[PDB]
Ligand binder design. Structure first.
Ligand SMILES: [Mg+2]
Ligand SMILES: [Mg+2]
Ligand SMILES: [Mg+2]
Ligand SMILES: [Mg+2]
Ligand SMILES: [Mg+2]
Ligand SMILES: [Mg+2]
Ligand SMILES: [Mg+2]
Ligand SMILES: [Mg+2]
Ligand SMILES: [Mg+2]
Ligand SMILES: [Mg+2]
Ligand SMILES: [Mg+2]
Ligand SMILES: [Mg+2]
Ligand SMILES: [Mg+2]
Ligand SMILES: [Mg+2]
Ligand SMILES: [Mg+2]
Ligand SMILES: [Mg+2]
Ligand SMILES: [Mg+2]
Ligand SMILES: [Mg+2]
Ligand SMILES: [Mg+2]
Ligand SMILES: [Mg+2]
Ligand SMILES: [Mg+2]
Ligand SMILES: [Mg+2]
Ligand SMILES: [Mg+2]
Ligand SMILES: [Mg+2]
Ligand SMILES: [Mg+2]
Ligand SMILES: [Mg+2]
Ligand SMILES: [Mg+2]
Ligand SMILES: [Mg+2]
Ligand SMILES: [Mg+2]
Ligand SMILES: [Mg+2]
Ligand SMILES: [Mg+2]
Ligand SMILES: [Mg+2]
Ligand SMILES: [Mg+2]
Ligand SMILES: [Mg+2]
Ligand SMILES: [Mg+2]
Ligand SMILES: [Mg+2]
Ligand SMILES: [Mg+2]
Ligand SMILES: [Mg+2]
Ligand SMILES: [Mg+2]
Ligand SMILES: [Mg+2]
Ligand SMILES: [Mg+2]
Ligand SMILES: [Mg+2]
Ligand SMILES: [Mg+2]
Ligand SMILES: [Mg+2]
Ligand SMILES: [Mg+2]
Ligand SMILES: [Mg+2]
Ligand SMILES: [Mg+2]
Ligand SMILES: [Mg+2]
Ligand SMILES: [Mg+2]
Ligand SMILES: [Mg+2]
Ligand SMILES: [Mg+2]
Ligand SMILES: [Mg+2]
Ligand SMILES: [Mg+2]
Ligand SMILES: [Mg+2]
Ligand SMILES: [Mg+2]
Ligand SMILES: [Mg+2]
Ligand SMILES: [Mg+2]
Ligand SMILES: [Mg+2]
Ligand SMILES: [Mg+2]
Ligand SMILES: [Mg+2]
Ligand SMILES: [Mg+2]
Ligand SMILES: [Mg+2]
Ligand SMILES: [Mg+2]
Ligand SMILES: [Mg+2]
Ligand SMILES: [Mg+2]
Ligand SMILES: [Mg+2]
Ligand SMILES: [Mg+2]
Ligand SMILES: [Mg+2]
Ligand SMILES: [Mg+2]
Ligand SMILES: [Mg+2]
Ligand SMILES: [Mg+2]
Ligand SMILES: [Mg+2]
Ligand SMILES: [Mg+2]
Ligand SMILES: [Mg+2]
Ligand SMILES: [Mg+2]
Ligand SMILES: [Mg+2]
Ligand SMILES: [Mg+2]
Ligand SMILES: [Mg+2]
Ligand SMILES: [Mg+2]
Ligand SMILES: [Mg+2]
Ligand SMILES: [Mg+2]
Ligand SMILES: [Mg+2]
Ligand SMILES: [Mg+2]
Lengths: 97, 113, 113, 225, 345, 93
């Protein structure tokens, strides 16, 4: 807006470009650390600050926003394990009380 | 591709590449030969007709006025061979000569553009 | 689909408005047995749960129809088409018994407390 | 049918009435004695009015479907359609094959079908349906909240309508609105389109419009970030 | 199909089949409703059971089976056994009290009947409180809840009929509804009328100036305690909100919520802040006296913002003593090894 | 129980319009239907393919995220002798 420049858009056409390359992490980054991973970008900066080689991406808020919008409708979207069992995206905020 | 008018037979450029990836019914279809045998043609006024037959059986093919025929009274026509001039529907070639055929038709028909 | 109901219209019918579907059992008839999964209208439904026919026809003046009706109303089983005799023709066209209500000035006999 | 002097026969529990003293019948609303099932009472002459219609389960609305859905043993309908599938001609067997599709997956793996009926509406998070201070004092909230209020008001007015006393027409009337409402948050426009009051004849984005939409969720989950 | 028509037809049809006669039918029903009351109460008297209990059991027997008790009100009255027990004592009531039982039900029915018949009355009424911000069906429904309210208080002894009576009891229910639900951010009835008066006043002011009144006129014309700050405030509350989801700029595909920034969330800059700040504040906190440093560290950084109430047993003199002496040695050595100077804020 | 089939040819649009993972199908056909069905049936989207696995913000199935190389370790001959010494130490008493 006013004084902070606002990020550039990473379009599908651009995603594929990376998809085509073996840019695995570089694409994850663009989808996590750089734009939607709330907890990720934070630990990301700080890590960079302490000269820490950036951390491994946490779940993107795009994902979490989705699951919940999806929960808003009857549907239940639950991630699973090696063996079909739960795993947790919403780090500790969904269990109750 | 093309526009309904007199006799516009094929489809060029991207329009075609769309008609190809998406299995579609060409503007000017070309009736393929479901049977591999020999050719026979007829005279009467309204509609033409090409018949493919083997010692086993024969099949009648309705070729209206606009259809310019590539085959002649006399020789063999493999399954899924062009018996009309122009475009071919992949589904039909699939059924007739097989997938191996369609697959090979699709690729080459695409590169043509 | 899963529930064999009119896939698209029996739903719309009972869902948003009052068109009833007899769920388990309903002994009394429409003319035929209880419709296990069939649906019916308010009207006919109404005719059921309270009693076959409702007819409230209330007389114009105080002495003409108030007498015709009263004489034959209290204990007398009134057959269908009971032709009450005074304004026009008070027509009671249905079943079993009858219950009249008030009585002004003419003659008082056999009425309630 | 009006009975004046009913008598006592104790095979089944005493039906109807006694001469004049004992009256076992229910008062004058709902009472099932024999095949005839309603009983009105006129203490004038001993007159036990006994209407004839009987216990007919009549329902409309998700109530009726909820029931229907619980009662079904998919296994039965699975085997029933199996036979209907291969044996009769193409007309009713074709319908049965499309109807066996859904029933199979239900049973196969995943979850069972009584859940399609809604009696507990999940509410989307709060910060996801903000209420924000804009300019001058203008505020800004996700369209979802006008829809949520819709349902809550209706749901409440329903409860209080049941409690206060219940004239049929009005209760359905509401239950209708209620239904419609439950659609609104989930998906708007499939059946009519809800509007914020005179200002914008705009479909309040439904949770659906959120996921799909002109520019929705999985949608812009791929346009870019 | 479309929802207004169906209900309109729905009750209009039933009124069409059962309007209530001017005097007779309304009198009749009325009389029965009251006798119900007198009945239920006298039933309460002889059974020791609360008139609320007597009321709900006669309701179940006349309005609906176990089905209506179980889903509407969760479960405290056993669907079968409970209500039945209650009906049994009602039967036991000899000739004298049994009469009240029989009356109560019949009265309960009549009630519903009167309510059914006077539904056109509501809709005719509710018809005019249309454009207030409530859906016609919502409006009729509240108004309906209003007519039921009237039914509870009408005294047939006092000759006036239910028409004029329902009118009031309905108009009150509607107006309330309009004031309680119409807005996203609730506004009390007084503020409401307040807003109407403000509007109306702005109307008479538009009448001649040719100048949409500065908030000067509105104050004057309004009355006793009206001032500019008051009017600017009310109309600020009068503006309903805006749709967070609204077409923005070239309406092509713009949605208003992607543009608002976020405040609680520590933009990276702040997470780095709390990292060094806490690590350096934690280093200083250790190599010190835990007597008055932790006191002011915990009293200030752990709970809430009390010199005296700050230190445990040791009075104020040792507080100010170590507070100001340790706080300055800490500051002056931090002046040496400049780490804090560059105001983290 | 011979499963007799018939080779079918469908358009690139449709080929994708209907596929294993509903995730991918939710992305372009009818998010509305795609889900409805994927739901009813209790669909376990095994993530393979980049579209579906990108929405997750998960590493891509194709590329350096290859099950063939996701796991590979490196060594210095110095750390090689160090680990075997750890094994030598395993000899008890
Ligand atoms: Mg953490
Ligand atoms: Mg991180
Ligand atoms: Mg470093
Ligand atoms: Mg480290
Ligand atoms: Mg992590
Ligand atoms: Mg879900
Ligand atoms: Mg042309
Ligand atoms: Mg032309
Ligand atoms: Mg032509
Ligand atoms: Mg075609
Ligand atoms: Mg010839
Ligand atoms: Mg010929
Ligand atoms: Mg030709
Ligand atoms: Mg040849
Ligand atoms: Mg050629
Ligand atoms: Mg084949
Ligand atoms: Mg073949
Ligand atoms: Mg071949
Ligand atoms: Mg083949
Ligand atoms: Mg070929
Ligand atoms: Mg059907
Ligand atoms: Mg049909
Ligand atoms: Mg059907
Ligand atoms: Mg309908
Ligand atoms: Mg049935
Ligand atoms: Mg009905
Ligand atoms: Mg006689
Ligand atoms: Mg008739
Ligand atoms: Mg008299
Ligand atoms: Mg006798
Ligand atoms: Mg026996
Ligand atoms: Mg069956
Ligand atoms: Mg059959
Ligand atoms: Mg069918
Ligand atoms: Mg349902
Ligand atoms: Mg301001
Ligand atoms: Mg609203
Ligand atoms: Mg009714
Ligand atoms: Mg009705
Ligand atoms: Mg609409
Ligand atoms: Mg509308
Ligand atoms: Mg509206
Ligand atoms: Mg609104
Ligand atoms: Mg409106
Ligand atoms: Mg839409
Ligand atoms: Mg949409
Ligand atoms: Mg009394
Ligand atoms: Mg006593
Ligand atoms: Mg409870
Ligand atoms: Mg208790
Ligand atoms: Mg029972
Ligand atoms: Mg029972
Ligand atoms: Mg007494
Ligand atoms: Mg108006
Ligand atoms: Mg008036
Ligand atoms: Mg104003
Ligand atoms: Mg005025
Ligand atoms: Mg203004
Ligand atoms: Mg703009
Ligand atoms: Mg931030
Ligand atoms: Mg530290
Ligand atoms: Mg130190
Ligand atoms: Mg210590
Ligand atoms: Mg120390
Ligand atoms: Mg130290
Ligand atoms: Mg301190
Ligand atoms: Mg402290
Ligand atoms: Mg405090
Ligand atoms: Mg202490
Ligand atoms: Mg000192
Ligand atoms: Mg000193
Ligand atoms: Mg010091
Ligand atoms: Mg300086
Ligand atoms: Mg398309
Ligand atoms: Mg399509
Ligand atoms: Mg797409
Ligand atoms: Mg839709
Ligand atoms: Mg599917
Ligand atoms: Mg790796
Ligand atoms: Mg190594
Ligand atoms: Mg050792
Ligand atoms: Mg040794
Ligand atoms: Mg040794």
């Amino acid at each position: 807006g006013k004084a902070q420049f606002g990020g550039q858009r990473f379009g599908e056409m651009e995603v594929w470009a990376l998809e085509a390359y073996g840019a695995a992490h570089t694409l994850q980054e663009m989808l996590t650390l750089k734009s939607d991973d709330i907890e990720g970008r934070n630990a990301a900066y700080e890590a960079i600050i302490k000269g820490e080689d950036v951390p491994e991406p946490s779940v993107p808020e795009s994902f979490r926003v989705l699951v919940k919008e999806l929960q808003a409708l009857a549907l239940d979207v639950q991630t699973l394990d090696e063996k079909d069992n739960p795993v947790d995206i919403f780090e500790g905020l969904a269990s109750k009380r | 591709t093309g526009g309904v008018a007199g006799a516009a037979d094929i489809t060029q450029g991207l329009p075609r590449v769309i008609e190809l990836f998406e299995a579609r019914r060409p503007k000017a279809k070309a009736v393929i030969s479901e049977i591999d045998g020999v050719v026979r043609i007829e005279e009467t006024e309204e509609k033409l007709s090409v018949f493919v037959e083997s010692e086993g059986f024969s099949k009648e093919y309705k070729l209206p006025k606009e259809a310019r025929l590539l085959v002649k009274d006399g020789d063999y026509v493999e399954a899924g061979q062009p018996l009309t001039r122009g475009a071919i529907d992949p589904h039909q070639l699939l059924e007739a000569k097989g997938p191996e055929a369609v697959e090979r038709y699709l690729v080459e028909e695409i590169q043509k553009v | 689909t899963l529930l064999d109901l009119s896939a698209t219209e029996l739903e719309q019918v009972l869902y948003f408005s009052k068109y009833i579907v007899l769920d388990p059992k309903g002994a009394i008839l429409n003319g035929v047995p209880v419709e296990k999964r069939q649906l019916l209208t308010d009207e006919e439904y109404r005719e059921l749960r309270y009693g076959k026919q409702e007819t409230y026809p209330l007389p114009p003046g105080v002495d003409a129809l108030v007498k015709d009706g009263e004489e034959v109303v209290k204990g007398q089983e009134l057959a269908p088409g009971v032709v009450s005799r005074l304004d026009g023709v008070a027509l009671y066209r249905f079943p079993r018994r009858v219950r009249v209500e008030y009585v002004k000035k003419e003659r008082a006999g056999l009425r309630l407390p | 049918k009006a009975r004046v002097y009913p008598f006592e026969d104790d095979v089944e529990v005493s039906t109807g009435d006694r001469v004049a003293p004992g009256d076992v019948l229910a008062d004058g609303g709902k009472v099932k004695s024999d095949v005839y099932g309603r009983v009105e009472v006129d203490l004038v002459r001993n007159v036990v009015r006994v209407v004839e219609s009987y216990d007919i389960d009549a329902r409309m609305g998700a109530e009726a479907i909820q029931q229907l859905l619980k009662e079904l043993d998919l296994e039965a309908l699975e085997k029933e359609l199996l036979e209907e599938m291969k044996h009769p001609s193409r007309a009713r067997r074709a319908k049965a094959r499309k109807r066996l599709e859904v029933v199979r997956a239900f049973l196969d793996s995943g979850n069972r079908p009584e859940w399609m009926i809604l009696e507990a509406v999940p509410v989307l998070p709060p910060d996801l349906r903000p209420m924000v201070q804009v300019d001058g004092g203008r505020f800004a909230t996700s369209d979802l909240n006008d829809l949520y209020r819709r349902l809550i008001n209706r749901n409440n007015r329903l409860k209080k309508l049941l409690a206060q006393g219940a004239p049929e027409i009005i209760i359905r009337n509401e239950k209708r609105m209620l239904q419609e409402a439950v659609d609104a948050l989930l998906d708007n426009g499939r059946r009519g389109a809800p509007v914020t009051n005179p200002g914008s004849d705009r479909p309040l984005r439904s949770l659906t419009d959120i996921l799909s939409g002109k520019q929705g969720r999985f949608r812009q989950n791929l346009l870019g970030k | 199909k479309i929802s207004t028509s169906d209900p309109v037809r729905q009750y209009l049809h039933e009124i069409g089949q059962v309007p209530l006669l001017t005097l007779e039918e309304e009198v009749e029903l009325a009389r029965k409703v009251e006798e119900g009351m007198e009945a239920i109460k006298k039933l309460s008297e002889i059974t020791g059971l609360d008139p609320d209990l007597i009321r709900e059991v006669v309701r179940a027997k006349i309005l609906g089976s176990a089905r209506v008790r179980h889903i509407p009100g969760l479960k405290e009255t056993l669907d079968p056994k409970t209500v039945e027990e209650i009906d049994q004592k009602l039967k036991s009531l000899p000739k004298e009290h049994k009469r009240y039982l029989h009356i109560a039900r019949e009265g309960e029915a009549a009630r519903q009947h009167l309510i059914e018949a006077n539904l056109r009355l509501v809709v005719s009424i509710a018809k005019k409180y249309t454009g207030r911000g409530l859906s016609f069906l919502d409006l009729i429904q509240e108004g309906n809840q209003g007519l039921i309210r009237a039914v509870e208080k009408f005294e047939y002894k006092r000759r006036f009929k239910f028409s004029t009576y329902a009118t009031w009891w309905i108009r009150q229910a509607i107006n309330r509804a309009i004031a309680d639900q119409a807005r996203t951010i609730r506004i009390p009835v007084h503020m409401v009328e307040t807003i109407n008066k403000l509007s109306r006043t702005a109307r008479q002011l538009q009448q001649e100036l040719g100048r949409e009144p500065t908030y000067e006129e509105i104050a004057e014309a309004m009355g006793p305690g009206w001032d500019a700050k008051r009017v600017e405030e009310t109309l600020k509350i009068a503006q309903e909100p805006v749709s967070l989801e609204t077409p923005i700029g070239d309406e092509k595909d713009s949605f208003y919520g992607d543009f608002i920034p976020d405040e609680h969330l520590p933009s990276p800059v702040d997470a780095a802040t709390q990292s060094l700040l806490s690590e350096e504040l934690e280093k200083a906190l250790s190599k010190l006296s835990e007597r008055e440093a932790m006191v002011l560290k915990l009293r200030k950084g752990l709970i809430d913002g009390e010199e005296v109430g700050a230190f445990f047993g040791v009075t104020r003199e040792r507080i100010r003593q170590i507070e100001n002496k340790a706080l300055r040695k800490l500051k002056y050595h931090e002046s040496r090894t400049r780490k804090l100077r560059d105001f983290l804020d | 129980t011979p499963v007799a089939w018939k080779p079918l040819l469908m358009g690139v649009t449709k080929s994708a319009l209907s596929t294993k993972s509903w995730l991918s199908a939710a992305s372009f056909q009818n998010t509305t239907h795609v889900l409805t069905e994927a739901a009813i049936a209790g669909k376990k989207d095994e993530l393979i393919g980049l579209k579906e696995n990108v929405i997750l913000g998960r590493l891509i199935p194709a590329g350096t995220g290859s099950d063939f190389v996701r796991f590979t370790q490196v060594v210095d001959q110095k750390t090689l002798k160090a680990i075997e010494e750890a094994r030598k130490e395993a000899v008890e008493a």
